Write a structure and sequence with these properties.
Chain B: It is found in: Virion. Chain B: Belongs to the turreted BTV-fold inner capsid family. Chain B: Homodecamer; each decamer is made up of two conformers of VP2, called VP2A and VP2B. 12 homodecamers assemble to form an icosahedral capsid. Interacts with VP6. Chain B: This is Inner capsid protein VP3. Chain A: It comes from Aquareovirus C (isolate Golden shiner/USA/GSRV/1977). This is part of a larger assembly, with 1 copy of chain A (411 residues) and 2 copies of chain B. Chain A is of the alpha/beta class and 411 residues long. Chain A has 12 helices and 14 strands. Chain A has helices spanning 22-29, 62-72, 77-80, 125-129, 131-148, 167-174, 181-194, 202-218, 277-293, 329-342, 348-375, 399-409, and strands at residues 6-8, 89-91, 99-101, 118-120, 155-160, 226-227, 231-235, 245-249, 253-254, 262-268, 298-300, 315-316, 321-322, 324-327. In chain A, α5 packs across α9. Helices cover 24% and strands 0% of the residues of chain B. Classes of the chains: A alpha/beta (411), B mainly alpha (50). Chain B binds chain C through residues 38-40, 43, and chain C through 44, 46-48.
């Protein structure tokens, strides 16, 4: 298994306290139930089936964001070795099974508020001694950290080995053909979440490949013309709703393995991710792999927010550092369409039309989000959506480098 | 009767058949994740599980 | 028209709604064709 993890709590965007009200906690972690594997309990195949368009939690990412903020107020044992209370609520037991209002006879100490708190598993010995039951904490803390480390989109990791796929993964994928991305992401989250597993497990390699294939198809390098061992992802028409992808297997030409093992970190540079299910699912799915296997290497600090500079066990600028790339969906879509034309899947006339459709679609997402922010100003004390500026929708980021990586990743 | 058939996997199947019978006296490591020396030999019916 | 955005609204986008506040009667949805193989339909069931 993996007997240790490191983490980092969220950042207050100038506000003095963590951003969530009692109702958020009461609804998102109430009923005295275990909160430790709930991230997919409020997701589905598509936005149309979800109440993400209005009222509280008016975004795809909204619920998971608040969850992360909520956890930041109660992860003190991995920072100071002691359970605490915040606004009258604390854990029921040293195992951190669930939350409850504080007892009246012997209340625990009140938590002193702080932000961007580094976390070590070793600070709380009982965790390791009860690893078999406290395992789910590992995954969620990792997820929270991977999101907390970045503004705009969360960070996740990619890698491709020099070897071909093992047979076991091939058979597993051959049973996941018609599945949409969201369902796939759930299984990955469900797998790593509920009991310890060793990194040398078939599922671990399986999900690792999925993240690779998803990105390769996202960049358009993997298509009906060119596929990874026969697999690739298919994206919905931009004319109706491009926020959907399904797995496919095909008799097209198979891409050759890279000359050397490739790996990097990724994130979305633009606010569109907050209301785009494929981004959320892809990030969560990829993060699940790193959760069970740990971080392969320190993340490059060069292009990260100020609070992310030089975080112990997480970020670095030395030799043993993996760079992190980022992209904007709109330029990415244009690149994907261009690759399709060069592969001959479409004509030039179609490519122009696809760009117009996707840009129109993205504009709606931006228009919705920007209107939603002023509806929920962060000064209100809870953050349903991460703050941003209008110019953030126009950043091209490192998109050119990103497609270059896929170029080298699937030769 | 091995070489008479046309199945490309026939050589491997022939090999594993003996391997099954010798699991106790001559145990070896089959370097294929998801398979064991006691897996029924007839099921080794694919490349990559060789 | 408010209850039929996906039928008369020129600016309707697939995958939207106002569920917590209002109910729309005409929408877009998915349908499936799952099969339910038995255990023996998954693997070689015999002695191993």
């Amino acid at each position: 298994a993996q007997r240790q993890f490191f983490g980092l709590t969220y950042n207050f965007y100038g506000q003095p306290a963590p951003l969530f009200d009692l109702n958020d906690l009461q609804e998102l972690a109430g009923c005295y139930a275990r909160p430790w594997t709930s991230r997919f309990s409020h997701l589905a195949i598509s936005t149309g089936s979800l109440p993400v368009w209005s009222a509280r939690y008016p975004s795809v990412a909204s619920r998971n964001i608040i969850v992360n903020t909520l956890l930041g107020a109660h992860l003190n044992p991995f920072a100071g070795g002691q359970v605490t209370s915040h606004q009258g609520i604390t854990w029921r037991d040293p195992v951190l099974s669930s939350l409850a209002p504080v007892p009246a006879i012997q209340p625990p100490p009140v938590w002193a508020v702080a932000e961007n708190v580094p976390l070590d598993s070793n600070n709380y010995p009982t965790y390791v001694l009860n690893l078999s039951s406290m395992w789910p904490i590992n995954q969620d803390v990792h997820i929270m950290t991977m999101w907390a480390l970045s503004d705009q989109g969360p960070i996740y990791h990619l890698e491709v080995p020099v070897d071909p796929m093992p047979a076991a993964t091939t058979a597993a994928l051959m049973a996941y053909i018609g599945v949409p991305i969201a369902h796939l992401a759930q299984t990955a989250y469900r797998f790593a979440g509920q009991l310890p597993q060793s990194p040398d497990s078939t599922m671990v390699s399986t999900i690792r490949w999925l993240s690779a294939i998803w990105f390769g198809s996202l960049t358009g390098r993997l298509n009906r013309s060119r596929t990874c061992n026969g697999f690739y992802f298919e994206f919905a028409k931009p004319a109706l709703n491009p926020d959907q992808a399904v797995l496919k297997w095909n008799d097209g030409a198979r891409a050759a393995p890279p000359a050397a093992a490739q790996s990097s970190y990724m994130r979305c540079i633009s606010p569109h991710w907050q209301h785009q299910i494929v981004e959320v699912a892809g990030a969560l799915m990829s993060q699940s792999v790193t959760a069970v296997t740990g971080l392969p290497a320190l993340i490059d600090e060069a292009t990260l927010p100020a609070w992310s500079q030089g975080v112990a066990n997480l970020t670095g600028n030395g030799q043993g550092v993996v760079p992190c790339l980022d992209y904007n969906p709109v330029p990415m879509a244009a690149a994907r369409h261009l690759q399709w034309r060069q592969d001959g899947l479409i004509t030039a006339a179609q490519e122009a039309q696809l760009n117009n459709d996707y840009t129109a679609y993205a504009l709606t997402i931006e228009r919705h989000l920007t209107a939603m922010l002023v509806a929920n100003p962060i000064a209100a004390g809870r953050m349903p959506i991460q703050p941003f500026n209008a110019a953030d929708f126009g950043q091209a980021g490192q998109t050119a480098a990103a497609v270059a990586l896929a170029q080298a990743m699937f030769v | 009767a091995g070489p008479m058939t046309s199945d490309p996997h026939s050589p491997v199947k022939v090999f594993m058949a003996l391997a099954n019978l010798l699991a106790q006296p001559e145990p070896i490591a089959i370097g294929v994740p998801g398979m064991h020396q006691t897996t029924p030999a007839s099921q080794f019916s694919h490349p990559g599980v060789w | 028209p408010l209850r039929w955005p996906g039928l008369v609204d020129p600016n309707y986008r697939v995958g939207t709604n106002d569920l917590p506040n209002r109910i729309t009667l005409y929408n877009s949805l998915y349908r499936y064709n799952f099969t339910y193989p038995t255990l023996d339909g998954i693997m070689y069931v015999r002695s191993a």
